[PDB]
């Protein structure tokens, strides 16, 4: 939490038509910086100049007059921050929730269960089956699919202020990646206290992204649509992006090998509801621009801010989409034929 004199990392050859205009601005462009700073050495009385590469998201400008290009980490503004220990891992392991003796868990084995009310087929267990603690948004990853068919659940669908929880029957592979070979450096500040920072970009400046099959996504989009259309009086249902909120809410968030992602789900929700297939053309992958950030605070206020140390070298993980979290726009509209 000190001053950072940051500069963008490498020049480029951006040209072509037109030319008369001058300054461009785009909110969707994942980019790194080359921040420089002084930090304390082994002894309090001395300090040295280090440089690190920080995601633009993780830094914020400060208006100093004595110098230019001055930034600070977003947290020095609000909360303390610690770095995830190298030894520990936030890999979602299946954990079993078990009841004490004299207690018991009851498992509903109904294949077309609604969430509430009677269960015809029940079975007692002492422990819950393996449940991986996956933290994601919009898309429910690596979860349990529905046995019967894809399911929609809500405390009451009519109350637009309560989340729709979709459960797919067949999973949809999603393969996300940070393709750049990022070298990392250890920066020490005493006594032996050190933090890993990204050092260099070996090779091309590549951009983070996710991949879903267009044929396989658009299908479940349809299959979900058909199940939704059944609930809202055969009204033709349509999908769109998030109306606002924190990035984590207006994007698909998760972590691969520890780095935390924020993928633009705009592409997944353009709509494309009418199925013609176009002679099975215009259908390969559907790629989403992903943004990556290191200083991160979950659970809002409860808990401190975390700095995710970079994993050296390019990374890529594949999860299976097993469900979704949706919310309906609700107001008076065209009674016939509105939707």
């Amino acid at each position: 939490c000190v001053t950072l004199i940051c500069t963008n990392v490498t020049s480029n050859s951006t040209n072509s038509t037109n030319g008369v205009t001058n300054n461009s601005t785009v909110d969707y462009r994942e980019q790194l910086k080359n921040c420089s700073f002084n930090i304390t050495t082994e002894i309090r009385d001395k300090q040295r100049k280090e440089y690190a590469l920080f995601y633009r998201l993780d830094i914020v400008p400060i208006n100093d007059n004595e110098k230019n290009d001055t930034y600070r980490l977003i947290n020095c503004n609000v909360s303390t921050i610690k770095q995830a220990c190298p030894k520990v891992t936030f890999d979602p392991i299946p954990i079993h929730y078990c009841a004490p003796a004299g207690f018991a868990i009851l498992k509903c084995r109904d294949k077309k269960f609604n969430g509430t009310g009677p269960c015809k087929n029940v079975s007692t267990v002492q422990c819950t089956h393996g449940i991986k603690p996956v933290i994601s948004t919009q898309l429910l990853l690596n979860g349990s699919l529905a046995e019967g068919d894809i399911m929609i659940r809500s405390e009451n669908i009519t109350d637009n202020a309560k989340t729709i929880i979709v459960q797919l029957k067949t999973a949809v592979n999603i393969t996300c990646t940070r393709p750049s070979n990022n070298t990392r450096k250890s920066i020490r500040f005493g006594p032996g206290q050190a933090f890993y920072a990204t050092d260099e970009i070996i090779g091309d400046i590549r951009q983070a992204h996710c991949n879903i099959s267009k044929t396989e996504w658009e299908d479940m989009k349809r299959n979900v649509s058909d199940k939704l259309k059944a609930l809202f009086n055969n009204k033709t249902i349509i999908f769109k992006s998030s109306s606002g909120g924190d990035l984590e809410i207006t994007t698909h968030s998760f972590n691969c090998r520890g780095e935390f992602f924020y993928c633009n789900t705009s592409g997944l929700f353009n709509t494309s509801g009418l199925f013609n297939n176009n002679s099975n053309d215009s259908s390969g992958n559907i790629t989403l621009p992903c943004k990556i950030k290191q200083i991160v605070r979950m659970w809002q206020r409860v808990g401190q801010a975390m700095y995710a140390p970079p994993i050296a070298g390019n990374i890529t993980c594949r999860s299976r989409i097993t469900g979704l979290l949706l919310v309906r726009d609700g107001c008076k509209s065209n009674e016939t034929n509105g939707t």
Epitope: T10, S13, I205, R206, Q207, H209, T287, P289
Partner: antibody, heavy 132, light 108 residues
Amino acid sequence: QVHLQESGPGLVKPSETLSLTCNVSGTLVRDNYWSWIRQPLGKQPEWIGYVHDSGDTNYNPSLKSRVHLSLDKSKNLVSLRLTGVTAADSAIYYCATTKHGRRIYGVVAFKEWFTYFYMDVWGKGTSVTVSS
Amino acid sequence: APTFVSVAPGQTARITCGEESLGSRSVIWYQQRPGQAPSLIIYNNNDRPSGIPDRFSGSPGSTFGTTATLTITSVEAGDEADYYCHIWDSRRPTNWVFGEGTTLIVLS
């Protein structure tokens, strides 16, 4: 046997615009991307700029201000104009068909690629001297 | 700058140009002789136009922190020339002059 060559004045004095011309044959002038190259005595070749019809042109930043390229259709030939010359500009010049392409290394969608230019056939070379 | 290398007639010569790569490059190689203008030998690192043999090998654009080495197997006498090259890198702005060419020679 597609071949070409240029035609210049030989000598120009300072503070004068150096005009040059690259007469061509074998193929059309519309059907090609066109370049200009100069190489002094015992030095490496310097890429001047390149041009194509439909209002497309790009220059070397060193002399993006001074050079003014042109293009004649019917005559099948190219042109050049370099203002405010000095002894620095004196070099042997050339003109060549600039065959271009695209180098892709990542996601095309995100513009993770770049376009490059090679020149497969050269002229003879117009020797240009700049002295008072 | 150093631009010379000695190789016997029948052996192989490897000549280098430009700074080490940062990203994927599209390295174009040329060859010039006295009087004549520079001629194209290789484009896109290892692709060659009409009239150039297979002996002319080139560094792949795929490598990083690496100098561009033009390798010519079984060096011919009439191949002694200036080899100015033109580098197109992903991570550096368009170069508008060519690189220094390791001039080629033969022992005997």
